[PDB]
Design a protein around this ligand. Structure first.
Ligand SMILES: NC(=O)c1ccc[n+]([C@@H]2O[C@H](COP(=O)([O-])OP(=O)(O)OC[C@H]3O[C@@H](n4cnc5c(N)ncnc54)[C@H](OP(=O)(O)O)[C@@H]3O)[C@@H](O)[C@H]2O)c1
Ligand SMILES: NC(=O)c1ccc[n+]([C@@H]2O[C@H](COP(=O)([O-])OP(=O)(O)OC[C@H]3O[C@@H](n4cnc5c(N)ncnc54)[C@H](OP(=O)(O)O)[C@@H]3O)[C@@H](O)[C@H]2O)c1
Ligand SMILES: CC(C)CC(=O)C(=O)O
Ligand SMILES: CC(C)CC(=O)C(=O)O
Lengths: 310, 309
């Protein structure tokens, strides 16, 4: 019923694009390194939640200008190349399209917004999912998959903004995925950092997946201390998270399957880490509030050092 | 002045050899590399002084075989006092001076209950870049000075200054720089400003001093850690000299690329000196109500790494 465009068909874009297509939506994929392989072989998903899923043939595109105008654009690219990202979105966007950034970090919508026409709605999609590019054209989905949507900016008034976020959530729900409308995209991005900041960084730094990090008492105490810093930074910036929120997130991660965070896969494959959106932007916002995050600041410095080493 | 060396590694081998090369009667107790040292001897390749060779050397595999020494240079690691203590006692002459050429905080006090109260327990702060190369070979890269401080023993206020002065004179006799320190605790805190950031980050970031100093992010991290140790020392009653971080950084800039002792330990599978270098300063700072979040986090990361397969 809706024409969906996927700008950046990686683990996230491939997964959500495939899931929507399997729900009967008209999905068009823009691919980069794997366009040729996915164009011929197709898209396939190994998922512990949804079983094996395949799309063949896929409506795949190597040029964004080849794509037809889409009502929703699912941005699955990393936050690392914003000026490379913007021209593609405008090309594939139908009049008044909804742009949904399926991206981690803080301040990402504001940073992309100057390049996007004011006629386009800009939304944030916070994905709680364990997923990675496993094999060329194959997506490895380990757990979860829910997406929470929030409206950032666009021509909609307050009622229409809620309707558009609800419309986006319902699309994923129709696909068999969990989805809720968030009242405050900025508050939700801060909440998501409480998990991404310790786990993404320590997985790279300590060369470890989630289970050994939770099993060892020192890493677990370090994770909790980092969580408190992010929660304090969120509070200092005007967003007070729920009571005992660190304990809730720690408990759920213990129930998580053994998992290597997205940033771990990035570091192993030599891809740029999303340090700017996940670490630098929270650190800068907290500094503006006069709130120091010593452990996060030190972790960011170590991550930058590791990226720069031969 | 019979000198004994308990733990003839890089540190014990270096200072023992320098004393022996200066005519002293030095007796080396060895562990893993005894048979190698007993045949080849001790060779010192020093970028500061040059090449020195001690062959043959008075080498021992058990402290029981050692004669009673007036000075005991302890160059062992701080990770096995239960093994270390009977060795010191067996090699100690009556009223001997035990010099702990070891990093960390609280090191002497942790050893004092296992040594007779008639022995003089001293600390030796060694600012030096030295490591064991091939068996029997000591690779000395930079610096080498030792500052001495008195911790415990039967000596009165007068003899405590004389004993610390006598030990410093031995090292100055051998061509080394050596200063008598009035406060061993403050001097140990000073040495921690270097070993806390550089030992841990070398293991954590799988790197040596040159890459850590050349990268702007790791350099800022080192500095931030240094200010934590400085602030903790001041919170515990020991105000360190001003701009000591900058002085340490400048010395490290003029250091050849160096792997701290803890880096060699991790690579060889030996236990890391975390208890003396991190746990003790953290607990001491905690009792003073001073928090070291970066050092606390570094210590947790190191404990994680040491427990991994
Ligand atoms: N479990 C997860 O993976 C997860 C969970 C939550 C949130 N996220 C967030 O989702 C976003 C993507 O993460 P990911 O795991 O999916 O990484 P990924 O597997 O590397 O996917 C990123 C995709 O974007 C493509 N891309 C980037 N620029 C492009 C351009 N101009 N044109 C066409 N394609 C372009 C990349 O192409 P190439 O593959 O050819 O390089 C890649 O396919 C990140 O912001 C991440 O924080 C990920
Ligand atoms: N440039 C430096 O190396 C440097 C500088 C400043 C401070 N330090 C500190 O000096 C001390 C020793 O450093 P290092 O570089 O000489 O290490 P090292 O090369 O490993 O030398 C240690 C020597 O003592 C032995 N040993 C280790 N633990 C022992 C124990 N519980 N009991 C008896 N003997 C033991 C070792 O036996 P094996 O032969 O079997 O290994 C070895 O012979 C450490 O506290 C270190 O932090 C070193
Ligand atoms: C639920 C998290 C594992 C997803 C995420 O944010 C990531 O892997 O980067
Ligand atoms: C004086 C330093 C270069 C030595 C040190 O801290 C070490 O190697 O453990």
């Amino acid at each position: 019923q809706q024409r969906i465009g996927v700008i950046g068909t990686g683990a996230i874009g491939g997964f959500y694009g495939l899931m929507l297509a399997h729900a009967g939506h008209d999905v068009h994929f823009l691919l980069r390194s794997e366009f040729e392989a996915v164009n011929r072989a197709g898209l396939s998903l190994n998922s512990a939640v949804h079983g094996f899923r395949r799309l063949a043939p896929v409506q795949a595109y190597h040029s964004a200008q080849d794509m037809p105008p889409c009502d929703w654009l699912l941005v699955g690219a990393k936050t690392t190349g914003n000026h490379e990202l913007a021209p593609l979105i405008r090309a594939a966007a139908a009049p008044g399209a909804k742009v949904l950034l399926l991206q981690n970090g803080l301040g990402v919508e504001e940073r992309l917004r100057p390049l996007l026409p004011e006629s386009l709605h800009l939304l944030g999609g916070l994905c709680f999912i364990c997923v990675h590019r496993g094999e060329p054209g194959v997506i490895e989905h380990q757990a979860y998959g829910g997406v929470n949507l929030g409206y950032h900016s666009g021509p909609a008034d307050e009622r229409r903004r809620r309707e558009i976020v609800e419309e986006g959530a319902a699309l994923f729900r129709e696909s068999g995925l969990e989805s809720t409308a968030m009242p405050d995209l900025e508050q939700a991005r801060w909440q998501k950092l409480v998990w991404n900041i310790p786990y993404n960084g320590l997985s790279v730094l300590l060369k470890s997946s989630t289970a050994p990090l939770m099993a060892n008492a020192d890493s677990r105490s370090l994770i909790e201390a980092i969580m408190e810093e992010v929660i304090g930074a969120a509070g200092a910036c005007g967003f007070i998270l729920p009571e005992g929120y660190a304990d809730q997130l720690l408990a759920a991660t213990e129930r998580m399957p053994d998992y290597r965070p997205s940033m771990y896969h990035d570091f192993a494959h030599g891809r740029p880490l999303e340090l700017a959106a996940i670490y630098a932007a929270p650190l800068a916002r907290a500094a503006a509030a006069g709130y120091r995050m010593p452990r996060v600041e030190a972790l960011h410095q170590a991550l930058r050092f590791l990226e720069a080493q031969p």
